[PDB]
Enzyme design. Structure first.
Site, PDB file in Angstrom:
ATOM      1  CG  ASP B  93      -6.121   8.032  12.015  1.00 32.45           C
ATOM      2  OD1 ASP B  93      -4.934   7.783  12.138  1.00 32.45           O
ATOM      3  OD2 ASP B  93      -6.536   9.156  11.773  1.00 32.45           O
ATOM      4  N   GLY B 186       4.763  11.308   6.597  1.00 32.22           N
ATOM      5  CA  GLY B 186       4.451  11.984   5.349  1.00 32.22           C
ATOM      6  C   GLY B 186       3.611  11.129   4.394  1.00 32.22           C
ATOM      7  CB  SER B 188      -0.180   9.008   7.946  1.00 31.63           C
ATOM      8  OG  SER B 188      -0.065  10.420   8.161  1.00 31.63           O
ATOM      9  N   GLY B 189      -2.544   8.978   5.877  1.00 30.35           N
ATOM     10  CA  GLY B 189      -3.615   9.553   5.081  1.00 30.35           C
ATOM     11  C   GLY B 189      -3.838   8.939   3.711  1.00 30.35           C
TER      12      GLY B 189
END
Ligand SMILES: [Ca+2]
Lengths: 8, 240
Positions: B93, B186, B188-189
Site C-alpha cells: 500500500d 481521512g 491514510s496516505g
C-alpha cells in the site's frame, strides 16, 4: 483491515 | 486523528493534503508526504481511482486561508506493481505521485526524511501521526492539522492473536492501540513520524484501521513500512 479513505 | 491535538503551523512541513475534484470544488481525501520537490508519497488505495487529484503543500487549516499554501497538479501516478485492492492485508500500500510543477521549499514546506532501507524500530519507539482525518469514529474531518503520539508496537506483538494476527505483515508498522488515539478516516496516505538519532523521519504510510472503529483497544493503526520500499522508491524516482 478497513482502509483509511472513503471507504477503501 | 482520534485523541489528537492541534499541531503547530510549522512542525510537520512535509505533510500534504491530497485532494480530489468534487462538483464545483476540491475536497480532502488523503494525506501524503512530500519527498522530493516534485514527488509525493502516499497510499496506493488513495489513488485507486479515476479521480482528478491535486496536492496541497504548506497547508494548516483546510477551510481558511493560511498565508502559506501552494496548490499543484498531479501529472503521474505510480502505484506499487504488487498492490492488490482486493487484498489490503497483503501489503504494498504505497504510491508515488509526480507533481506538475516543483514546489518552493520554505519553513512551511520541506522534504520528509526517509529511513535507511531495512530499518526496524524498537517496540515502544516515539512516533507521531499527523493528518486532517476524522476526530472520532464515524465523526467528521478536522479543519486543522492534528497530531497524536503513537508509539510503535513491534511485529511480534502486533501479529499476535490478541492484536492483529496474520493480517499484519513484516512489511508494515503498527503503532498505538490504546483505545484512545488513532489514525482515522481521512488520515491514510499520511506519515508516521518517528524520532531516530535526534531527527524525525517518516517510517510509515498510514494504511488501515479496524473494521470496528478507529480507536480500538489493541488494534493499533497500521502503516506501510517505508523502509521496506527504499529501493523501489529510488528506482521510480530514477526512471520517470
Ligand atoms: Ca484548502
Amino acid at each position: 483491515x478497513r482502509t483509511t479513505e472513503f471507504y477503501v | 486523528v482520534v485523541g489528537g491535538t492541534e499541531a503547530q503551523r510549522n512542525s510537520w512541513p512535509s505533510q500534504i493534503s491530497l485532494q480530489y475534484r468534487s462538483g464545483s470544488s476540491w475536497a480532502h481525501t488523503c494525506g501524503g508526504t512530500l519527498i522530493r520537490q516534485n514527488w509525493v508519497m502516499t497510499a496506493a488505495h488513495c489513488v485507486d481511482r479515476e479521480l482528478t487529484f491535486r496536492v496541497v503543500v504548506g497547508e494548516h487549516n483546510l477551510n481558511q486561508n493560511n498565508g502559506t499554501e501552494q496548490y499543484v497538479g498531479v501529472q503521474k501516478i505510480v502505484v506499487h506493481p504488487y498492490w492488490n485492492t482486493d487484498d489490503v492485508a497483503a501489503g504494498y500500500d504505497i504510491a508515488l505521485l509526480r507533481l506538475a510543477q516543483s514546489v518552493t521549499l520554505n519553513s512551511y514546506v520541506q522534504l520528509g526524511v526517509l529511513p535507511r532501507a531495512g530499518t526496524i524500530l524498537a517496540n515502544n519507539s516515539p512516533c507521531y501521526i499527523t493528518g486532517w482525518g476524522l476526530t472520532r469514529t464515524n465523526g467528521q474531518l478536522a479543519q486543522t492539522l492534528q497530531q497524536a503520539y503513537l508509539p510503535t508496537v513491534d511485529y511480534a506483538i502486533c501479529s499476535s492473536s490478541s492484536y492483529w494476527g496474520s493480517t499484519v505483515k513484516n512489511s508494515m508498522v503498527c503503532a498505538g492501540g490504546d483505545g484512545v488515539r488513532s489514525g482515522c478516516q481521512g488520515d491514510s496516505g499520511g506519515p508516521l513520524h518517528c524520532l531516530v538519532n535526534g531527527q524525525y523521519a517518516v517510517h510509515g504510510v498510514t494504511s488501515f484501521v479496524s473494521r470496528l472503529g478507529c480507536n480500538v483497544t489493541r488494534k493499533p493503526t497500521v502503516f506501510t513500512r517505508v523502509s521496506a520500499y527504499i529501493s523501489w522508491i529510488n528506482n521510480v524516482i530514477a526512471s520517470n
